[PDB]
Amino acid sequence: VANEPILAFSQGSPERDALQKALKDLKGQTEAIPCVVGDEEVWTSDIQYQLSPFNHAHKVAKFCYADKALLNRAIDAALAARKEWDLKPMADRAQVFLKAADMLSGPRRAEVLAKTMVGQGKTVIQAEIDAAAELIDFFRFNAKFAVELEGEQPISVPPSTNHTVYRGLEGFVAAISPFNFTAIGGNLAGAPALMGNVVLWKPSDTAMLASYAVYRILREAGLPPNIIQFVPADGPTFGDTVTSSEHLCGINFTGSVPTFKHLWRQVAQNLDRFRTFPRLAGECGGKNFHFVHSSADVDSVVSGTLRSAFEYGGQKCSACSRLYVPKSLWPQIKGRLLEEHSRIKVGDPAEDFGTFFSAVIDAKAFARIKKWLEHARSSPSLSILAGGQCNESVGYYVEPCIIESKDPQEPIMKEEIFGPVLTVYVYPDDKYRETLKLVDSTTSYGLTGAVFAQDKAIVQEATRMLRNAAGNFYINDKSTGSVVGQQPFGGARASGTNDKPGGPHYILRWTSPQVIKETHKPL
Amino acid sequence: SLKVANEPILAFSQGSPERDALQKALKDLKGQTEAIPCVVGDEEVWTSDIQYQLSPFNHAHKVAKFCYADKALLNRAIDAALAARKEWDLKPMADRAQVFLKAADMLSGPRRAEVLAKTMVGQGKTVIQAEIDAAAELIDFFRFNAKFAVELEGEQPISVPPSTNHTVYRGLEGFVAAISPFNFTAIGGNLAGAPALMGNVVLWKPSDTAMLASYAVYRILREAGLPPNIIQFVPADGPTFGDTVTSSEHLCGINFTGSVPTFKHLWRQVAQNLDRFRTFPRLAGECGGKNFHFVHSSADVDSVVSGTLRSAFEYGGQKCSACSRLYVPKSLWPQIKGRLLEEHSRIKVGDPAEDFGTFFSAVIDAKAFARIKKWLEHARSSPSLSILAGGQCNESVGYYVEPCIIESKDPQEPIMKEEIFGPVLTVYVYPDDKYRETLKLVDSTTSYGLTGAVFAQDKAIVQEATRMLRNAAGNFYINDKSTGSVVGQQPFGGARASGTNDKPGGPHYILRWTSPQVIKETHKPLG
Numbered sequence A: 001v002a003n004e005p006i007l008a009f010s011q012g013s014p015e016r017d018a019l020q021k022a023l024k025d026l027k028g029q030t031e032a033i034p035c036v037v038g039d040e041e042v043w044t045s046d047i048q049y050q051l052s053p054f055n056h057a058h059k060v061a062k063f064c065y066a067d068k069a070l071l072n073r074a075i076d077a078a079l080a081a082r083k084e085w086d087l088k089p090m091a092d093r094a095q096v097f098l099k100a101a102d103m104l105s106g107p108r109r110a111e112v113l114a115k116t117m118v119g120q121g122k123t124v125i126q127a128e129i130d131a132a133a134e135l136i137d138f139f140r141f142n143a144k145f146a147v148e149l150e151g152e153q154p155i156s157v158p159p160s161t162n163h164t165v166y167r168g169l170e171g172f173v174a175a176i177s178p179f180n181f182t183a184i185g186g187n188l189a190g191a192p193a194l195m196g197n198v199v200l201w202k203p204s205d206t207a208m209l210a211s212y213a214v215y216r217i218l219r220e221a222g223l224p225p226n227i228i229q230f231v232p233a234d235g236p237t238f239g240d241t242v243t244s245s246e247h248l249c250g251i252n253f254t255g256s257v258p259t260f261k262h263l264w265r266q267v268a269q270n271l272d273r274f275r276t277f278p279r280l281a282g283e284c285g286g287k288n289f290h291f292v293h294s295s296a297d298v299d300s301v302v303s304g305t306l307r308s309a310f311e312y313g314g315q316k317c318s319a320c321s322r323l324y325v326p327k328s329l330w331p332q333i334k335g336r337l338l339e340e341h342s343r344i345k346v347g348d349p350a351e352d353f354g355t356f357f358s359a360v361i362d363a364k365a366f367a368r369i370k371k372w373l374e375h376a377r378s379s380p381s382l383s384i385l386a387g388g389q390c391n392e393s394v395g396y397y398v399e400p401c402i403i404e405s406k407d408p409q410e411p412i413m414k415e416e417i418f419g420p421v422l423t424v425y426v427y428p429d430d431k432y433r434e435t436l437k438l439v440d441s442t443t444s445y446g447l448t449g450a451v452f453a454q455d456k457a458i459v460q461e462a463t464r465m466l467r468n469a470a471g472n473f474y475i476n477d478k479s480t481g482s483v484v485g486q487q488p489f490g491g492a493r494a495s496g497t498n499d500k501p502g503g504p505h506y507i508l509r510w511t512s513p514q515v516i517k518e519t520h521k522p523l
Numbered sequence B: 001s002l003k004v005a006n007e008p009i010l011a012f013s014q015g016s017p018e019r020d021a022l023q024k025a026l027k028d029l030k031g032q033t034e035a036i037p038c039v040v041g042d043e044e045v046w047t048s049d050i051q052y053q054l055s056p057f058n059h060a061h062k063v064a065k066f067c068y069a070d071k072a073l074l075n076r077a078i079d080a081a082l083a084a085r086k087e088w089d090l091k092p093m094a095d096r097a098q099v100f101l102k103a104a105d106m107l108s109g110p111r112r113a114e115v116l117a118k119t120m121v122g123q124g125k126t127v128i129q130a131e132i133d134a135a136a137e138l139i140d141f142f143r144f145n146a147k148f149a150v151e152l153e154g155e156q157p158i159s160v161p162p163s164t165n166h167t168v169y170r171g172l173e174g175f176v177a178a179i180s181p182f183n184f185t186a187i188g189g190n191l192a193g194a195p196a197l198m199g200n201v202v203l204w205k206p207s208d209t210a211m212l213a214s215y216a217v218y219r220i221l222r223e224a225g226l227p228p229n230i231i232q233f234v235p236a237d238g239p240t241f242g243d244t245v246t247s248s249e250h251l252c253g254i255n256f257t258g259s260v261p262t263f264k265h266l267w268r269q270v271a272q273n274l275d276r277f278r279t280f281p282r283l284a285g286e287c288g289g290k291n292f293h294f295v296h297s298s299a300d301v302d303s304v305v306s307g308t309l310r311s312a313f314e315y316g317g318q319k320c321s322a323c324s325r326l327y328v329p330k331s332l333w334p335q336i337k338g339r340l341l342e343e344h345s346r347i348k349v350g351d352p353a354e355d356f357g358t359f360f361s362a363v364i365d366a367k368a369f370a371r372i373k374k375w376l377e378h379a380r381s382s383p384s385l386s387i388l389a390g391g392q393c394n395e396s397v398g399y400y401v402e403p404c405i406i407e408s409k410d411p412q413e414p415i416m417k418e419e420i421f422g423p424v425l426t427v428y429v430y431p432d433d434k435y436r437e438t439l440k441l442v443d444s445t446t447s448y449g450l451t452g453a454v455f456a457q458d459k460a461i462v463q464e465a466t467r468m469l470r471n472a473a474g475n476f477y478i479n480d481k482s483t484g485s486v487v488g489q490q491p492f493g494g495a496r497a498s499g500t501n502d503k504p505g506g507p508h509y510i511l512r513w514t515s516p517q518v519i520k521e522t523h524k525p526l527g
């Protein structure tokens, strides 16, 4: 398999026309999205709404939270389907995901893009790289990795033959997905299912519309009933229920550090009830850096940093939120950042394809981000250089904000904001080595980071010094936009378990191998 | 790339160089006690907490005097290991691999007799059980893991213009605690050695009852070029060690083999301490089993009897993989019972250093002896159990237990469920026409999922049992015994209560001990 092409959406192109039609189709719509257990559409009385982030008067979906009883029925129904699904040849399971990938590439592309735009607030290009390219790539590449894994067999020596069976995990896997990438939800539920597992998928409330579109595509591509249960739910209720089940065998999570730690602690408390040791996989975000050396290409620093910090409103686990600049380059970088900032268009991405980014995801995110802007207006070490405005009357709109910090270890340099808020620390040129140490030591995180420099010795030194500051490390490129099969994604420190989805080893977390030795002569 | 093959098993025939060398090594050890220090860096350290390892078959012989590291020494060992880690992690994988390939060659040749003899005298193994463990399996772990690790670096992502992508297989940031069991010298070497190979630094707490052979392996690794502070040799009280390592902000992994309750305890301690760690520690555990041999009416009776006696009684049944429950159809029970009892009468229990005709020797220690004796007493009292052969034990000289065969009328009796770790085989006879229902009981009776075997010549029965027992055994055997997995041929491990199933012996085990970084370098200015 190869990576899915990124379409250009130029005027008069088939994909631009198809996307505009899909957006028109969605403009006034609310989809009633049920829980799905097997083939049954189930409604509880716990009704919830997903709002369009840039137009919160538009309820894009009405859904409901599964209660503990419904979640337990979903577990039981999934467990009863597991053995036959696990016994299927790997290639037959992979065929479901290859078919889904082709549907997403072609006839369903405009739908999943438009649902990601209207429901999660993405622009055309951000939806395209996510709900199409990244998701399609997860399905195709994981299918390839899984079929290839079957070829990894042990040595046989007569008179015995040895065979490894890549069993699914025994029990069910809980997939808990975040709002910010449609593709992550598809992968969190889809990768374990590919490996013969059955899954309770709790999608993010704020990504419900696009998540259900992916679910339906999987069912239409041939995924049998009870392999993935579509079970929106209150977060704590879902976590309490799955960690209380004797049949839990895995949690595939992406989201905040405290939530992942809480789930880890609940599993540990309940070890005596489980049939086997559950496998926890978590990617937990970052406080990601762009570090500039005086030899850097300033134009690349400026465009890469504006994109990394502000695309999708900075709502990426990989987004740059701390920029380190040498004093010698600061007049150039400050002047260019502030000028380009005034040309950033914030607005409705469905109505204006010129939009750079749109509203943040929901009222809670808006309130958190506003608190950080208020902090930047208060702190003696922080100065807002550009932006700082927000307005939630129509959508959850936050302008891009550029802040300078005189304190390299200010809280704003340490804590993940998940909004369009870039903090810059200007360091003296002769203190670049001490500043590299600050990049490594200042935060709890280890996810992404970039070095911009045209000096080979500097790049080699910075690569060594930052070895554990970033699991995805970039030289003369921006910190966002990892591509499946090219930059397997993840990091350690507080950023999670670093299972590298996007590479060939991720699927090994979702199989528990059995080795069969058959001896052909008497003992 | 690198070419490795399994280490050949030697015959130890009369007059052979290896038999003479082993006899000399045993003669050397017979009256000796080695004083084994803790080793931090290159420093030999003694604490006041003096302990002794006894020879299981002659417990008046203290084979080693060692000491338990105190919390101060454990924390000093952590600090010194962390100060050596970055340079070790930055070494090329092939340079780290060379240490383990050199150690493997030393174990294969000049040190073979030493590590075999120390495993025999200190752990109670016979010649052949020591040979397959302290030589073959350990040598194979070192060579095969070296090959797997060197080849892993060739697993690289796709590059597309204008950028080049490379994966760096970093060691984990922090230190790894390796906690090993008494019953295989090889497991201790792998638990500490595999993480070190991958660029980690390690505190190795060996088993008290395998101390002599464990230190011999440690010294060989150092002589093979392992730098100081990469593996700290820190015997310690178990709970004291676990408390210390799980309280360190720098813990990044625990590589464990032993009992289920100990692993769960460590898992809970890590979870309680999550807010102080720099990263999420990786716990790996293999935790034993209640392993089965299932016999179909079409089985080869001779294979059933020899394979079951070996699996149940070699090394006194003190194997995570040992058969402790035998399921026999009523039609074959007369043939199998008669042959089991006849062959049982020929099993020689004795001193393995003095009599190479010994089948197996004493169990490991007084605690194991006392537990096994309580199970034998339970077999005498229970109305569902009857002792068919064996049943006696005597600890006046060593911890000696006769091999014991018990028949249960209850397939759910506690003796069919709980791991004894002794030479105690329980037999359940089932009606031929209920083989399918009995297969379900094989699957559901215990909490474990480690090893199991089916003996049958009917291909359809084999296929049916293989499907029905898919999650009852991570190492499943068709017409062979449930013990004796070989590195690179049967990667070893299982799920359910048997642990995390990371399959040491196969190519994926080392992935638990690396945290990859991907570097993208872009060669054109951004637009």
Ligand SMILES: O=C(O)[C@H]1C[C@H](O)CN1
Binding pocket: A123, A124, A125, A126, A307, A311, A312, A355, A356, A357
């Ligand atoms: O993220 C996006 O949609 C595009 C729009 C702007 O040109 C920056 N990148």
Ligand SMILES: O=C(O)[C@H]1C[C@H](O)CN1
Binding pocket: A134, A181, A184, A316, A318, A479, A480, A481, A482, A483, A489
């Ligand atoms: O921004 C990135 O690097 C990728 C990784 C994650 O799957 C979401 N997008």
Ligand SMILES: O=C(O)[C@H]1C[C@H](O)CN1
Binding pocket: B126, B127, B128, B129, B310, B314, B315, B358, B359, B360
């Ligand atoms: O385990 C051993 O040492 C050998 C002794 C007996 O012949 C069966 N195997």
Ligand SMILES: O=C(O)[C@H]1C[C@H](O)CN1
Binding pocket: B137, B184, B187, B319, B321, B482, B483, B484, B485, B486, B492
């Ligand atoms: O008995 C066995 O199968 C192997 C597995 C473990 O390493 C100890 N010996």
